[PDB]
């Protein structure tokens, strides 16, 4: 039982020689330079997220050009993700890049597209036109992931509302406004996004973090909007509203993965239930084998201090325990004072949680919840991981070009690193979001086709030998769709 395994732990227990959980960071003013991006990569960042709710196509271009440059200079594959705007509502900019709203103070929310560029604590912009008709005196307006709340007192015209500010808090530019239960009709796939998405395909982003997904049909609209040029790009659905959670089943089916975007969720649903939701999504992904990302406010206080609170630590670790493939840093790196220290601490908390975990349980639990009869190749991965546990193999080698086989292995949670040998360089970046995998690029255009698998398999084992996973005389399990599995001794 879980209680029995807790008794066997010790603070002194040596950490694993590899990290499994994958870190994702958000690139902002604090982290756009190559000299900072290199910092994040060495500190533990696997994926760079670009939030398209801020900055121009001119800005994100620079992010892309610098992420890639910092990667090549360090000799690693780092993935780039586009995060769509979606059917959100955003405030407008402010004079001084921010506003300081105080408890008791009164403010003005206009829908005048000329209060976009200028924003006081007294008056600012909200980019939903119909706003005046959606609200009544008494109803709240939530600013910034449910932190700041304004109570509506009255109208002023057919554009502006008088609003009591109920709590003190500083807001910067373009904070998300959230209206709970207001049936707020907004383009399931907005015009701004079709623009944003096609830019992603052209520059060659590795994955799309689709915001505010609510239905299966909605995901199709995204992939259809990506065009035939971007069929290879992954679609990670951000579950952050009431219905998205209720329709999780069918969304997972269409999607390539899930993000528990807790910021918006923690407003749209009663905050205590966010916890239940987390569990549900994560585990449901674990069963399917589609990577899951936990995100938002996990290390919030490290935007200011150099050390997280005991709650914040708890969160990161407990998330890894819940089965999250990926943990993600938002404002913590985008505008934080400690962008390297925040990544290091997360990588370290991840190791600790992962070492004090029993992966063997995860393996059996997942296997139990699989529909017998399994497919040909899924059984192979299953059993080949069952092989790892019985043999205490210190590494695994999988040959997947598309990436499927690699993930399908990681699905069954082995207690060793999974080395994935692929000929396609994109697959290496796209695997930076599935847990406990490392990718090795086998250059097809200068080392030959190798339909004998001989040179590739031995390349993966060399990577294992170099990273110090296996020595001379340790066991390594090798799979290659993949329908053949072998256990070999290493020289």
Ligand X SMILES: Nc1ncnc2c1ncn2[C@@H]1O[C@H](COP(=O)(O)OP(=O)(O)OP(=O)(O)O)[C@@H](O)[C@H]1O
Which residues lie near ligand X (CB under 6 A)?
26, 28-29, 51, 53-55, 83, 145, 172, 176, 263-264, 330-331, 334-335
What is the helix (H) or strand (E) element at residue 176, kind and residue range? strand 176-178
Catalytic residue among 22, 85, 121, 238: 238
Q: Which of 63, 387 has the CB closer to ligand X? A: 63
Instruction: State how beta strands 326-329 and 22-26 pair.
Output: parallel
- Closest residue by beta carbon to K ion: 53
Least Cβ distance, residue 185 to a copy of itself (angstroms): 47
Nearer to ligand X by Cβ, of 86 and 289: the residue is: 86
Q: Please report whether residue 486 would count as binding a copy of itself according to CB under 8 A.
A: yes
Distance CA 413, CA 273 (A): 28
DSSP letter at 91?
B
What is the nearest approach in angstroms of K ion to the Cβ of residue 83?
Answer: 5
| Tokens encoding 89 | 């509502």
> What is the DSSP pairing of strand 257-261 with strand 148-155?
unpaired
Helix extents (H) in 18-177 = 34-43, 57-74, 131-134
* 53 binds, options K ion, ligand OXL, Mg ion, none, Cβ within 5 to 8 A by partner type: K ion
From CA 308, how far away is CA 306, in angstroms rounded?
Answer: 7
Q: Would residue 335 show up in a list of annotated catalytic residues for this protein? A: no
Residue 289 binds which of Mg ion, ligand X, K ion, none (CB < 5-8 A, kind-dependent): none
Cβ contacts of residue 451 below 8 Å, gap of 6+?
Answer: none
- Please tell me whether residue 53 binds K ion under the rule CB under 5 A: yes
- Sign of torsion, CA 200 205 211 215? positive
Counting contacts by CB under 5 A, is residue 264 touching Mg ion?
Answer: yes
DSSP per residue, 318-348: HHHHHT-SEEEESHHHHT-S-HHHHHHHHHH
Backbone phi, then psi, for 270, in 5-degree steps?
-55, 120
Map residue 125 onto helix, strand or coil. strand
Q: Which of 38, 68, 90, 284 is catalytic?
A: 90
Rounded Cα gap, residues 232 and 228, in angstroms? 9
Q: Does 380 bind a copy of itself (CB under 8 A)?
A: yes
Total residues binding Mg ion (CB under 5 A): 5
| Residue 422 marked in a binding site | no
Q: Work out whether 7 is an interface residue with a copy of itself (CB under 8 A).
A: no
Smallest distance, Å, CB 299 to ligand OXL? 13
Separation of alpha carbons 402 and 399, rounded Å: 9
3-state secondary structure of 209: strand
Q: How many whole angstroms separate alpha carbon 204 and alpha carbon 192?
A: 18
Q: How many binding residues for ligand OXL (CB under 6 A)?
A: 10
The site partner of 268 among ligand OXL, K ion, ligand X, none (C-beta below 5 to 8 Å per kind) is: none
Among the listed residues 49, 85, 175, 262, the single catalytic one is 49
Site string for K ion, 210-239 (x = CB under 5 A): -x----------------------------
Minimum separation from the CB atom of position 455 to a copy of itself (A): 18
Q: Report the candidate in 288, 320, 332 with the shortest Cα–Cα distance to residue 43.
A: 332
49 assigned to active site: yes
Residue 124: name its binding partner from Mg ion, K ion, a copy of itself, none (Cβ under 5 to 8 Å by kind). none
Closest CA to 370 of 415, 326, 420, 411: 411
Give me the 328-357 binding string for Mg ion, x by CB under 5 A, dash otherwise: --x---------------------------
Residue 67 or 395 with smaller CB distance to ligand X: 67
Choice among 63, 110, 160, 296 that is catalytic: 296
For a copy of itself, the binding residue among 58, 158, 390, 454 (CB under 8 A) is 390
In sequence order, what DSSP letters do the residues of 236-287 get, joined into one string? Answer: EEEE-SHHHHHTHHHHHHHSSEEEEEHHHHHHHS-HHHHHHHHHHHHHHHHH
**How many chain residues bind a copy of itself (CB under 8 A)?**
26
262 part of the interface to ligand OXL, by CB under 6 A:
yes
Residue 83, annotated as binding a ligand: yes
Return d(Cα 398, Cα 407) in angstroms, integer. 10
Residue 211 found at the interface with ligand OXL (CB under 6 A) = yes
**Rounded CA gap, 41 and 62, in Å?**
17
> Is 240 annotated as a binding-site member?
yes
Q: Is 90 annotated as a binding residue?
A: yes
- Would you say how long the chain is, in residues? 491
Which region, judged by CB under 6 A, interacts with ligand OXL, from 12-20, 218-226, 241-249, 260-268? 260-268
Closest to Mg ion by CB, 240 or 359: 240
**Which one-letter DSSP state was computed for residue 227?**
-
Question: For residues 185 and 87, is the Cβ–Cβ distance under 8 A?
Answer: no
Reply yes or no on whether 238 is catalytic: yes
Out of 374, 425, 444, 458, name the contact with a copy of itself by CB under 8 A: 374
Does 206 participate in binding ligand OXL (rule CB under 6 A)?
no
Q: Are 233 and 200 in contact (CB under 8 A)?
A: yes
The verdict on whether 310 is a catalytic residue reads: no
Binder among 264, 300, 341, 378 for ligand OXL (CB under 6 A): 264
Which residues contact a copy of itself by CB under 8 A?
367, 370, 372-374, 376, 378-380, 382-384, 386-387, 389-392, 475, 483-489
Residues belonging to the active site: 49, 90, 238, 296
- The footprint of ligand OXL (CB under 6 A) covers 145, 211, 238, 240, 261-264, 295-296
Q: Which residues are annotated as a binding site for substrate?
A: 49, 263-264, 296
């Amino acid at each position: 039982s879980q209680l029995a395994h807790n008794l066997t732990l010790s603070i002194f227990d040596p950490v694993a020689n590899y990290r499994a959980a994958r870190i994702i960071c958000t690139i902002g003013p604090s982290t756009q330079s190559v000299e900072a991006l290199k910092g994040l990569i060495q500190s533990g960042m696997s994926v760079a997220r670009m939030n398209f709710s801020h900055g121009s196509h001119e800005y994100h271009q620079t992010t892309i050009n610098n992420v890639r440059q910092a990667a090549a200079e360090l000799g690693v594959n780092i993935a780039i993700a586009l995060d769509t705007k979606g059917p959100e509502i955003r405030t407008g900019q402010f004079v001084g890049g921010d506003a300081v709203m105080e408890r008791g103070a009164t403010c003005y929310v206009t829908t005048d597209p000329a209060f976009a560029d200028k924003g006081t604590k007294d008056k600012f912009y909200i980019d939903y036109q119909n706003l005046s008709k959606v609200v009544r005196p008494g109803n709240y307006i939530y600013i910034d992931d449910g932190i700041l709340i304004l109570q509506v007192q009255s109208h002023e015209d057919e554009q502006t509302l008088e609003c009591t500010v109920t709590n003190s808090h500083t807001i910067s530019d373009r904070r998300g406004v959230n209206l709970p239960g207001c049936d707020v009709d907004l383009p399931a796939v907005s015009a701004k996004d079709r623009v944003d998405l096609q830019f992603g395909v052209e520059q060659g982003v590795d994955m799309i973090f689709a915001s505010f997904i609510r239905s299966a049909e909605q995901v199709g609209d995204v992939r259809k909007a990506l065009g035939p040029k971007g069929r290879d790009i992954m679609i990670i659905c951000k579950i952050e509203n009431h219905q998205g959670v209720q329709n999780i089943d069918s969304i997972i089916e269409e999607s390539d993965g899930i993000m528990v975007a807790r910021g918006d969720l923690g407003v749209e649903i009663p905050a205590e239930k966010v916890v239940v939701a987390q569990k549900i999504l994560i585990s449901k992904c674990n069963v399917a084998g589609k990577p899951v990302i936990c995100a938002t406010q996990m290390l919030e206080s490290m935007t200011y201090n150099p050390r997280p609170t005991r709650a914040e630590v708890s969160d990161v670790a407990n998330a890894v325990f819940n089965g999250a493939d990926c943990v993600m840093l938002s404002g913590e790196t985008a505008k934080g004072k400690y962008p390297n220290e925040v990544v290091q601490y997360m990588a370290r908390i991840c190791l600790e949680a992962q070492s004090a975990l029993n992966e063997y349980v995860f393996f059996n639990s997942i296997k139990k919840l699989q529909h017998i009869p399994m497919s040909a190749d899924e059984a192979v991965c299953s059993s080949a991981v069952n092989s790892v546990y019985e043999t205490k193999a210190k590494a695994m080698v999988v040959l997947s070009n598309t990436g499927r086989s690699a993930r399908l292995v990681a699905k069954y949670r082995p207690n060793c690193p999974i080395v994935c040998v692929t000929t396609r360089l994109q697959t290496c970046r796209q695997l930076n979001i599935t847990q406990g995998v490392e990718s090795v690029f086998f250059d097809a255009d200068k080392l030959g086709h190798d339909e004998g698998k001989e040179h590739r398999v031995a390349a993966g084992v060399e990577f294992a030998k170099s990273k110090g996973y296996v020595q001379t005389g340790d066991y390594c399990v090798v799979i290659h769709y993949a329908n053949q599995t072998r256990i070999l001794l290493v020289e």
